[PDB]
Write a protein that binds this ligand. Sequence first.
Ligand SMILES: *[C@@H]1O[C@H](CO)[C@@H](O[C@@H]2O[C@H](CO)[C@@H](O[C@@H]3O[C@H](CO[C@H]4O[C@H](CO)[C@@H](O)[C@H](O[C@H]5O[C@H](CO)[C@@H](O)[C@H](O)[C@@H]5O)[C@@H]4O)[C@@H](O)[C@H](O[C@H]4O[C@H](CO)[C@@H](O)[C@H](O)[C@@H]4O)[C@@H]3O)[C@H](O)[C@H]2NC(C)=O)[C@H](O)[C@H]1NC(C)=O
Ligand SMILES: *[C@@H]1O[C@H](CO)[C@@H](O[C@@H]2O[C@H](CO)[C@@H](O)[C@H](O)[C@H]2NC(C)=O)[C@H](O)[C@H]1NC(C)=O
Ligand SMILES: *[C@@H]1O[C@H](CO)[C@@H](O[C@@H]2O[C@H](CO)[C@@H](O)[C@H](O)[C@H]2NC(C)=O)[C@H](O)[C@H]1NC(C)=O
Ligand SMILES: *[C@@H]1O[C@H](CO)[C@@H](O[C@@H]2O[C@H](CO)[C@@H](O)[C@H](O)[C@H]2NC(C)=O)[C@H](O)[C@H]1NC(C)=O
Ligand SMILES: *[C@@H]1O[C@H](CO)[C@@H](O[C@@H]2O[C@H](CO)[C@@H](O)[C@H](O)[C@H]2NC(C)=O)[C@H](O)[C@H]1NC(C)=O
Ligand SMILES: *[C@@H]1O[C@H](CO)[C@@H](O[C@@H]2O[C@H](CO)[C@@H](O)[C@H](O)[C@H]2NC(C)=O)[C@H](O)[C@H]1NC(C)=O
Ligand SMILES: *[C@@H]1O[C@H](CO)[C@@H](O)[C@H](O)[C@H]1NC(C)=O
Ligand SMILES: *[C@@H]1O[C@H](CO)[C@@H](O)[C@H](O)[C@H]1NC(C)=O
Ligand SMILES: *[C@@H]1O[C@H](CO)[C@@H](O)[C@H](O)[C@H]1NC(C)=O
Ligand SMILES: *[C@@H]1O[C@H](CO)[C@@H](O)[C@H](O)[C@H]1NC(C)=O
Ligand SMILES: *[C@@H]1O[C@H](CO)[C@@H](O)[C@H](O)[C@H]1NC(C)=O
Ligand SMILES: *[C@@H]1O[C@H](CO)[C@@H](O)[C@H](O)[C@H]1NC(C)=O
Ligand SMILES: *[C@@H]1O[C@H](CO)[C@@H](O)[C@H](O)[C@H]1NC(C)=O
Ligand SMILES: *[C@@H]1O[C@H](CO)[C@@H](O)[C@H](O)[C@H]1NC(C)=O
Ligand SMILES: *[C@@H]1O[C@H](CO)[C@@H](O)[C@H](O)[C@H]1NC(C)=O
Ligand SMILES: *[C@@H]1O[C@H](CO)[C@@H](O)[C@H](O)[C@H]1NC(C)=O
Lengths: 122, 122, 122, 431, 42
Amino acid sequence: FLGFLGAAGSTMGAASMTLTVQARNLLSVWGIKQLQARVLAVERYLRDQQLLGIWGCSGKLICCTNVPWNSSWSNRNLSEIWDNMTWLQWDKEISNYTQIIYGLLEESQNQQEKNEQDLLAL
Amino acid sequence: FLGFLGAAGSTMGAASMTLTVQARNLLSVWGIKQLQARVLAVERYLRDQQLLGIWGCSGKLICCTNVPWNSSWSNRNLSEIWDNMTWLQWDKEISNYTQIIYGLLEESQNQQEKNEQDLLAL
Amino acid sequence: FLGFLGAAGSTMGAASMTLTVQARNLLSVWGIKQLQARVLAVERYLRDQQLLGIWGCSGKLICCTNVPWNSSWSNRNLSEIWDNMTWLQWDKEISNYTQIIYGLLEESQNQQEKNEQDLLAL
Amino acid sequence: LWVTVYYGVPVWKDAETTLFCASDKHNVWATHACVPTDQEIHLENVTEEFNMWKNNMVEQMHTDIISLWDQSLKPCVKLTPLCVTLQCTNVTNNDDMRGELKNCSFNMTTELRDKKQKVYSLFYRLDVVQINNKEYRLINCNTSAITQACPKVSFEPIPIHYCAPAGFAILKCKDKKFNGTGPCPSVSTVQCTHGIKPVVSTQLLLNGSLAEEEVMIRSENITNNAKNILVQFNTPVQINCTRPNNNTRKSIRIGPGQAFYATGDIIGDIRQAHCNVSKATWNETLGKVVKQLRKHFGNNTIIRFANSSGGDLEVTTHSFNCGGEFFYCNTSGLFNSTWISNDSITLPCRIKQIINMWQRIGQAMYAPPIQGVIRCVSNITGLILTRDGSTTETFRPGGGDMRDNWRSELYKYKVVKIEPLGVAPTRCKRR
Amino acid sequence: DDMRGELKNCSFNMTTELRDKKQKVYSLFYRLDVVQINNKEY
Ligand SMILES: *[C@@H]1O[C@H](CO)[C@@H](O[C@@H]2O[C@H](CO)[C@@H](O[C@@H]3O[C@H](CO[C@H]4O[C@H](CO)[C@@H](O)[C@H](O[C@H]5O[C@H](CO)[C@@H](O)[C@H](O)[C@@H]5O)[C@@H]4O)[C@@H](O)[C@H](O[C@H]4O[C@H](CO)[C@@H](O)[C@H](O)[C@@H]4O)[C@@H]3O)[C@H](O)[C@H]2NC(C)=O)[C@H](O)[C@H]1NC(C)=O
Ligand SMILES: *[C@@H]1O[C@H](CO)[C@@H](O[C@@H]2O[C@H](CO)[C@@H](O)[C@H](O)[C@H]2NC(C)=O)[C@H](O)[C@H]1NC(C)=O
Ligand SMILES: *[C@@H]1O[C@H](CO)[C@@H](O[C@@H]2O[C@H](CO)[C@@H](O)[C@H](O)[C@H]2NC(C)=O)[C@H](O)[C@H]1NC(C)=O
Ligand SMILES: *[C@@H]1O[C@H](CO)[C@@H](O[C@@H]2O[C@H](CO)[C@@H](O)[C@H](O)[C@H]2NC(C)=O)[C@H](O)[C@H]1NC(C)=O
Ligand SMILES: *[C@@H]1O[C@H](CO)[C@@H](O[C@@H]2O[C@H](CO)[C@@H](O)[C@H](O)[C@H]2NC(C)=O)[C@H](O)[C@H]1NC(C)=O
Ligand SMILES: *[C@@H]1O[C@H](CO)[C@@H](O[C@@H]2O[C@H](CO)[C@@H](O)[C@H](O)[C@H]2NC(C)=O)[C@H](O)[C@H]1NC(C)=O
Ligand SMILES: *[C@@H]1O[C@H](CO)[C@@H](O)[C@H](O)[C@H]1NC(C)=O
Ligand SMILES: *[C@@H]1O[C@H](CO)[C@@H](O)[C@H](O)[C@H]1NC(C)=O
Ligand SMILES: *[C@@H]1O[C@H](CO)[C@@H](O)[C@H](O)[C@H]1NC(C)=O
Ligand SMILES: *[C@@H]1O[C@H](CO)[C@@H](O)[C@H](O)[C@H]1NC(C)=O
Ligand SMILES: *[C@@H]1O[C@H](CO)[C@@H](O)[C@H](O)[C@H]1NC(C)=O
Ligand SMILES: *[C@@H]1O[C@H](CO)[C@@H](O)[C@H](O)[C@H]1NC(C)=O
Ligand SMILES: *[C@@H]1O[C@H](CO)[C@@H](O)[C@H](O)[C@H]1NC(C)=O
Ligand SMILES: *[C@@H]1O[C@H](CO)[C@@H](O)[C@H](O)[C@H]1NC(C)=O
Ligand SMILES: *[C@@H]1O[C@H](CO)[C@@H](O)[C@H](O)[C@H]1NC(C)=O
Ligand SMILES: *[C@@H]1O[C@H](CO)[C@@H](O)[C@H](O)[C@H]1NC(C)=O
């Protein structure tokens, strides 16, 4: 056990076994200021959980999806990503490709929603 | 792409392929006005997510359920519902029976929640 | 139908028929008193949903886990728990064993999260 | 390779936010506007860049210390009736405390609107301005009315912890040679800061936190003479205050339920109020300051300490509060030396009762007399120097801006915004 | 016919920044802002 953000400097493979530690800490003059800090924490948490549900990843911490990895985003191989890079370094590399990936996941699930809707119709 | 509420005039069959568009737009002196509207948007969103949870439809946009259609709520066949009417025309038709169906969906899930629960005990 | 908390005195077996009755009733300067009570109910509800989500129980009123029941928590047989005790009596008996159970359920899910994630790549 | 989304990554960006107070007889910075406290996690291999000079906690703490000051003065007496004409005579009519006082007689309102009250009080010469037993008036009477410093609230600073809200973290630089800027090899995530006492003072950082290994010199741009130099000591220099007089507070009923506390009589030791700093301890502390100050200007340069140039009494003197009564010490014997490559120092201090504290105009405060003898024990834990624009560098004491006082306590802290959503390539493929 | 036929040149005692001192001042007030009390008194 490392603690909150303990694996920030750890490799992506090693830091992915402690996702629960960071996940559980995202939810919980000194009056309204302290009260609006709690409402901001809930709204920030709820819009992240909404994104997971839209991508079909609701209730999951590691969600393998159907969107293929465009090599333009990152040409590195798996060995030097999950064993040589940390999540802070990785976020810097793909910070500009984040929004195009988000749209790809959003539409891919929307296609899967109608694909399973038609399969159940038979 | 049509946009938010763009398929409001589209038929029910065509407007059900754009649910992700409306779903993601339900979440995002003079300081409480901004703040109290945000809290009411979060509360309303959670009420509809709670209803989907107790119907067994959590994390789904199209959720086929086990509740039969009585035909006393609407005698129209599938051809003239999903290819002629729009979701606004349909909403004005079963508004009377909305709470009748909302009770049947909750009751069906609760019975289904235990039939599956009793099945795992074998 | 007994109503909200109607099965409080029923046995644990009979009180489990009506988990949806209590579940739906947990969610719904004088304005601030009402407004701060609304925010407290929302974040209190979300912390319970978050706990279920990290145990792999999200969207389920009854969830089966992979944590064996250590007899140290309670050595009473299954027949004298679901047909003789009420839920209020049970909560007082395992009150001190609650937190150690909560950690085991969290450790059981993320073990299944990674094992299924690993097996899914084969 | 495919995009996989990780939620909860340890990634943070710099951010400005509203940190809430926390603390562990009412106070100016009371616990009724704060939260009870309860912690520190060492972030290995993390090298963050701090900047104590563009830190928003310093700017926010200045706003909050001011805000708690005004909030603590509204519910108590406003001295509008104290703008009358004063018939003031000397107290001594001849080096003492009594040469600093005027014995002022005036007509005051009674608790009954139609009745007056011939009363008198001893006012410091720094609070009365002559009108042309002569005729005087209180000094802040053409600018504002002085809300009386409420007698049941204490000016003693209690430690306050500034704690970050959810989604934010406070990074603490644990480096012991960290000046104020650049990378910090040792970083930690604290729930929130150590107890920062809001000690209000000028030219000297009374009480507070010491340096760890050696005297630290901290300037935004050491080559710019317009920037204050925040010296931080490693061993504190103890300074002892006093007002030897046995004051006699007197109560005047200026209205229904309102009382005005006045100096009725002064007896006892009438030596001028003063502060004592050990001459041996101060000399070796300036020796350490000079040693750490030649590193930025040269080994052969001449470091000379002069006294304050000029301006307001709040900026030319070591203004501070001690025992509820506000002192203004000369500190011209402290800063008087030239450095080439049992005894004590007595600093004559004046006292005022009408205080314009936060360098503002239009909001004064009347500090009521403190009954008895006032005694004082403080630690000089730092300095605020200004450099003069040749082989000789002259360092005069500085101050005025109260933010440099709290910039010396919040130099090691930094607020960051957690960015928990990150994408990265992996051999995954959604099924 | 002029603007000056719409104005009254009103002189009054006003308080000073010192409570015990008065201030004999004057101002031009529009006739629409002053009501007579029964150099008249308005
Ligand atoms: C500095 O100067 C001050 C005066 O400004 C000195 O203070 C006075 O000290 C004398 C003793 O030296 C005190 O006289 C005694 O009174 C006590 C009982 O006093 C009580 O009632 C008083 C009247 O209401 C009250 O003032 C007292 O003090 C309280 O209230 C004041 C504010 O008003 C506050 O400042 C204080 O802190 C107190 O809360 C107190 O309630 C009496 O018992 C004494 O003993 C004599 O009488 C007995 C028999 O009764 C006899 O046996 C003894 O031998 C002795 O003769 C005596 O009458 C006086 O009350 C003090 N006055 C004030 C205003 O406090 C102070 O001592 C000087 N200090 C120095 C450093 O020299
Ligand atoms: C307090 O008020 C009295 C009057 O109520 C002042 O006494 C007057 O002083 C003026 C001179 O300025 C004389 O012309 C009057 O004759 C005095 N009236 C008396 C003595 O009844 C007195 O000066 C005031 N005291 C102050 C302002 O300290
Ligand atoms: C309020 O009155 C004080 C005292 O008269 C004014 O300060 C004086 O200003 C003159 C003119 O510059 C100086 O010569 C005096 O030395 C000042 N006296 C002190 C004690 O500083 C002050 O300017 C007045 N304020 C306003 C707003 O009118
Ligand atoms: C610096 O800290 C010291 C110690 O806390 C302060 O002195 C204390 O002041 C309070 C209130 O006046 C007294 O009750 C204590 O007895 C004092 N302690 C000692 C050891 O004398 C001092 O006032 C502070 N300096 C400031 C605030 O400028
Ligand atoms: C502060 O101390 C200084 C130095 O003691 C005082 O000012 C000077 O004192 C020396 C001799 O002590 C004189 O030769 C100078 O002419 C003084 N300069 C002045 C009076 O401007 C000073 O009086 C003390 N107090 C203040 C408030 O400055
Ligand atoms: C301003 O006040 C003065 C008095 O301070 C007024 O002058 C007085 O007027 C009355 C008539 O109403 C006379 O009986 C007094 O003798 C006057 N006193 C003097 C001249 O010292 C004056 O009228 C006031 N001006 C106004 C109200 O515009
Ligand atoms: C991959 O990204 C490039 C831009 O970086 C884009 O032009 C290309 O269309 C993308 N390929 C796919 C299959 O999305
Ligand atoms: C349809 O609703 C009516 C009441 O409106 C009810 O009597 C009837 O039983 C329902 N149909 C079925 C099949 O349950
Ligand atoms: C049950 O809990 C006890 C502690 O009370 C512990 O000693 C024992 O090993 C546990 N049984 C297991 C882990 O099987
Ligand atoms: C820092 O790096 C070392 C090896 O370079 C590693 O052993 C250690 O775990 C890292 N720190 C953290 C907090 O993971
Ligand atoms: C009052 O004191 C001042 C300064 O100490 C002095 O100039 C003045 O002459 C004194 N007034 C007297 C003695 O009447
Ligand atoms: C403070 O220290 C850092 C790191 O040693 C250095 O880069 C910076 O220049 C120093 N500050 C000044 C004002 O020189
Ligand atoms: C300061 O020192 C002088 C003698 O140098 C002494 O008389 C006085 O009492 C001292 N005051 C304090 C507060 O130490
Ligand atoms: C300050 O006072 C303390 C006792 O309160 C004494 O021990 C110390 O020597 C004094 N120091 C100076 C510099 O006056
Ligand atoms: C600084 O000292 C000089 C004499 O050394 C004095 O004239 C001047 O007033 C002092 N300035 C202050 C104390 O601000
Ligand atoms: C000054 O600091 C010392 C330790 O450095 C401490 O023991 C003493 O109480 C402090 N004096 C104060 C805060 O008045």
